[PDB]
Amino acid sequence: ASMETLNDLVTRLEHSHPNSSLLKDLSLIQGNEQYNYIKWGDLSNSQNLNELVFQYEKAPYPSITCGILTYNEERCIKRCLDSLGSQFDEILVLDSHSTDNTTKIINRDFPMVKVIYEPWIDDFSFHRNKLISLTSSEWIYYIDADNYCVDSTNKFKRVAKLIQFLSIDCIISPMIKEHIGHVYTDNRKMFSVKKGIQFKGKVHEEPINADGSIPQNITVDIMICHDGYDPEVINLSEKNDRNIKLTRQMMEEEPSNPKWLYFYARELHYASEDTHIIETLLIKAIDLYKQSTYKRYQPEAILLLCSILFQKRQIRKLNEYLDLLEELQPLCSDVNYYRSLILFYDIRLKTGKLLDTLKSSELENNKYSFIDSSKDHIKALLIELYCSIDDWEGAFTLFDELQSTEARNKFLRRVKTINTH
């Protein structure tokens, strides 16, 4: 009863059965090489592998309930429901007594959907834990009313079947694409309801194991869209205020929990509040993380602080927090991202000083050339320096001053390419 990774199993099947349902389901799991499973024999024996593949073939699909919180979502509720298809065995909408057409649109166009009511009490976990309560299926998947699936393809059913069949203990995250096109992978939206999992936290809630441990998240190749942060459609300030209210509530409940300090900092940052207050909150959070087994968001907190420190040019302090992050997360790309930002800033600074020194040492200061009386060669070098530091206005300005054809070409060439290309 050996154990190997999902990726190891993938390899075998990519030789043995490239059209097996098992391989097709496995390849929905991202980061396959993480995560282990237990085999019940020698799978390099082609008979045993055929029996595994065939046993997956005829295994049942777990039942899955889709749970949806609603409050005043007439804008998008139909978009949401239509995107789900017919995968799910049940669709519960827990509505907080909407005064728009939300429930009318549901009753009218979606008679299969069950609508339950529960008044809002400023606790996302309470509402989501109520949906768990009402679920008949083996699994739940949560989608929000301002979300919609692109490529349904029965992938929810398939993922549930695979995870259950291979006895993997986890929460499942689809990918969630914001309206700007940025994709989030740690969402924690789909799990079995038979293990005593409960959400905790009034906002920025997450699923917690019944023993209080933090479950492993596995991201799957299912794309969900969101427009809840699109300023053309919604009042971003209203939601930022909702989040601040509930985050503050959570801080009062759970001081010394760094999670809420980070989110408080993050929300004040969206509202363009005093960065020194944000800075102090993040420093306190990072310090609190050291008392905590809970590590989620520590990287994100360090990186928000970094963004502020870089902006304030506190390079020494910034490097100390990058070093800390490098230690906590050896393979995190963001460290060298920031190390690179520091280097580039200094490069542009050096360039700017060179430009200024040249300009004002031969600012027509009587001094004479032997290469060009018009000093167009110096002007042309200054132009290159301007483009180098992304000061195109200064470039265009001095370009107009050029009294030549050879001097003008280098810039004209470059400009032509941009318009066309």
Ligand X SMILES: O=c1ccn([C@@H]2O[C@H](COP(=O)(O)OP(=O)(O)O[C@H]3O[C@H](CO)[C@@H](O)[C@H](O)[C@H]3F)[C@@H](O)[C@H]2O)c(=O)[nH]1
343 binds a copy of itself (CB under 8 A): yes
User: Quick one: which of 11, 55, 133, 361 contacts a copy of itself (CB under 8 A)?
Assistant: 361
Task: From the list Mg ion, ligand X, a copy of itself, none, pick the one residue 204 interacts with, judged by a Cβ distance below 5 to 8 Å according to partner type.
Answer: ligand X
User: Quick one: which of 203, 278, 302, 402 contacts ligand X (CB under 6 A)?
Assistant: 203
CB of 124 or CB of 262, closer to a copy of itself? 262
> Which residues is the chain interrupted after (C–N above 2.5 Å)?
none
Which range in 140-148, 176-184, 247-255, 289-297 contacts Mg ion by CB under 5 A? 140-148
Task: From the list a copy of itself, Mg ion, ligand X, none, pick the one residue 37 interacts with, judged by a Cβ distance below 5 to 8 Å according to partner type.
Answer: none
User: How are beta strands 36-38 and 3-5 bridged, if at all?
Assistant: antiparallel
Within 169-228, which residues bind Mg ion (CB under 5 A)? Answer: 228
Closest residue to ligand X, based on beta-carbon distance: 228
Looking up tokens 């949906």 gives: 131
Looking up tokens 């166009």 gives: 109
- Distance CA(305)–CA(322), nearest Å, equals 10
Task: From the list Mg ion, ligand X, a copy of itself, none, pick the one residue 120 interacts with, judged by a Cβ distance below 5 to 8 Å according to partner type.
Answer: ligand X
CB of 26 to a copy of itself, least distance (A): 19
- Distance CA(236)–CA(136), nearest Å, equals 35
Tokens for 226, please give them.
Answer: 């969101």
CB of 83 or CB of 319, closer to ligand X? 83
- Distance CA(111)–CA(94), nearest Å, equals 15
Helix 6-16 with 46-57: angle, nearest 10 deg: 100
User: Quick one: which of 69, 171, 172, 380 contacts ligand X (CB under 6 A)?
Assistant: 69
394 binds a copy of itself (CB under 8 A): no
336 binds a copy of itself (CB under 8 A): yes
- Distance CA(285)–CA(302), nearest Å, equals 9
Give residue 275's identity as a one-letter amino acid code. T
Taking a C-beta distance cutoff of 8 angstroms, is the pair 92, 103 a contact?
Answer: no
User: Quick one: which of 117, 120, 294, 337 contacts ligand X (CB under 6 A)?
Assistant: 120
Closest among 159, 111, 110 to 139, alpha carbons compared: 159
51 binds Mg ion (CB under 5 A): no
145 binds ligand X (CB under 6 A): yes
117 binds ligand X (CB under 6 A): no
User: Quick one: which of 368, 386, 394, 401 contacts a copy of itself (CB under 8 A)?
Assistant: 368
Task: From the list ligand X, a copy of itself, Mg ion, none, pick the one residue 124 interacts with, judged by a Cβ distance below 5 to 8 Å according to partner type.
Answer: ligand X
Which range in 2-10, 139-147, 270-278, 354-362 contacts Mg ion by CB under 5 A? 139-147
CB of 227 to ligand X, least distance (A): 9
Give residue 217's identity as a one-letter amino acid code. N
- Distance CA(338)–CA(358), nearest Å, equals 30
Which range in 59-67, 142-150, 283-291, 371-379 contacts ligand X by CB under 6 A? 142-150
Task: From the list ligand X, Mg ion, a copy of itself, none, pick the one residue 271 interacts with, judged by a Cβ distance below 5 to 8 Å according to partner type.
Answer: none
418 binds a copy of itself (CB under 8 A): yes
- Distance CA(322)–CA(330), nearest Å, equals 11
Taking a C-beta distance cutoff of 8 angstroms, is the pair 107, 77 a contact?
Answer: no
CB of 239 or CB of 296, closer to ligand X? 239
Give residue 222's identity as a one-letter amino acid code. I
Helix, coil or strand: residue 36: strand
Task: From the list ligand X, Mg ion, a copy of itself, none, pick the one residue 205 interacts with, judged by a Cβ distance below 5 to 8 Å according to partner type.
Answer: ligand X
Could you tell me the maximum CA-CA distance found in the chain, to the nearest angstrom? 92
Taking a C-beta distance cutoff of 8 angstroms, is the pair 189, 237 a contact?
Answer: no
Helix 334-361 with 315-328: angle, nearest 10 deg: 160
CB of 309 to ligand X, least distance (A): 27
79's enclosing H/E stretch is: helix 77-84
- Distance CA(386)–CA(320), nearest Å, equals 33
165 binds ligand X (CB under 6 A): no
User: How are beta strands 64-70 and 139-142 bridged, if at all?
Assistant: parallel
374 binds a copy of itself (CB under 8 A): yes
User: Quick one: which of 228, 299, 352, 394 contacts ligand X (CB under 6 A)?
Assistant: 228
414 binds a copy of itself (CB under 8 A): yes
Taking a C-beta distance cutoff of 8 angstroms, is the pair 154, 88 a contact?
Answer: no
**Where along the sequence are the contacts to ligand X (CB under 6 A)?**
69-71, 73, 96, 120, 124, 144-146, 203-205, 228, 239
Residues found near Mg ion in the complex (CB under 5 A): 144, 146, 228
